[PDB]
Amino acid sequence: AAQTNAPWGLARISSTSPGTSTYYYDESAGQGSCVYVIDTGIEASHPEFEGRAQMVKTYYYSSRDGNGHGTHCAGTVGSRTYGVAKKTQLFGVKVLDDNGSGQYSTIIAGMDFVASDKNNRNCPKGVVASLSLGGGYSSSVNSAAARLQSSGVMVAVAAGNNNADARNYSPASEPSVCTVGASDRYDRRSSFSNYGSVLDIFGPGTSILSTWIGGSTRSISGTSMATPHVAGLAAYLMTLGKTTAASACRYIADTANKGDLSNIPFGTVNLLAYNNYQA
Template sequence: MRFAHTSAGATVPPDTLPLPAAVDRAWAWGAATGRGVRVCVIDSGVDPAHPAVGGDVPLYAAEEAGDGTWRVVEDDAGDVAGHGTACAGIIRGLAPDAETTSVRVLTKNLRGNGEAMLAALSWAVDQGFDLVNMSLSTRKEALKERLHDLADRAWFKGVTLVSAAHNSPVISYPWRFPSVISVGSHAVDDPEYLEVNPDPPVDVFAAGVNVRVPWPGGGTKVVSGNSFATPHVVGLSARVLQEHPRFRTAQLRQVLAAVADNVDGRPARSRP
């Protein structure tokens, strides 16, 4: 793996987690499929016609208004780069009944405007989505304070932001904010295999190495990166929120840690 913030395979002592023996996956999500949970994917758009995505994804985009401000409007461009379709497909694969909405902020070369990201996130918080998938970040210090305020607003409103750690060993946002669930990658070929990180700021590791994902046009592609680990965590979180709809970010973070596969002494799950 050539990108940063990946699992080193460390285990975590069970006494560092609250009531680890009382929280298992049957209690955490049981047979939940994400039904009734609203997810916003802020990315490059989504191809709703892809069979792995489901066809019922409302499409929006952040656009610049004439006065220099940004707003979120209805969109018909779909996915301009493939990245968003991959993320939406991963979420649907784990939580097929989650209600997914796309907000396009990235261009075909996966570049983006920080103001567009802020506008999209502000809109998502105002709309009250349960989960926001942010497989992107910014290194611009000028945006840090406003983005931090938005992340805090999401925390207090009960909107959980799940954000990819940067693939390079750099500081970027919002994944480094404590109000955000931050995600790095591991190389285990199992979409439900989850590790809690004993050495933050990354909270958890999920599948992000050589992951086969849906790609616009009906095909698939094998990709690697923390971007693709993040929707795995969103999909599992959608299951938890169906089963425990009153949970917020703090409870989700604790449950994800409690059911992680690298808690020392826990029996290994059977995996495909």
């Protein structure tokens, strides 16, 4: 399948080269997989989700995305125009209030929720969790992410937007999940992107166009926008049978574009997510 005039990030993940604008992907498109977007909620009614998105859990007075951040990440995972896996199922877990903030205990509870809730969902191709969130180091947030990964969900988390070593952030520093940095359309490390030995992969993170609340769209930046590219890619690769939840991050890193990124600090992986689809 070929999506002409795709967002640069989608075109990048199916390209050996920057600077193209067509997204190439196998039509299976994540069919039969599930991605949990653990964030501010998802505006499920957005026409870009085609009835494939729904809220399954909130810890606040509403499950509605009053922020837009969770809707935007969900759109990068699986919306028809802006998504990596255009046929996956999107399950919203609202752990962040409409200010974008949330207590670690609520975030931990949401990860444990996903690790149990997947047994209530039909995900024969497998389960992914996209965690475009984080804060300071927390061994209990790390362990919650490790438990979610251990239960058979591929966990993709943002490295963080501090232009620092991700070692001091959670769940970015949990080694067993998949920590995602951000790159820009010129294959530069995003100026804000965290780095370090704990990073596993980079995805498009600068000026990412996706869905927004009120049925709209907008372009915003963050390692938080690189994560749903990797989450979506995983669900795409799992649907294709090329990897499992336990080995998806390792597979994505094995098959990534090597050494194409600039301003990658010494000791950080120079790997850019790549679906390696041959049309």
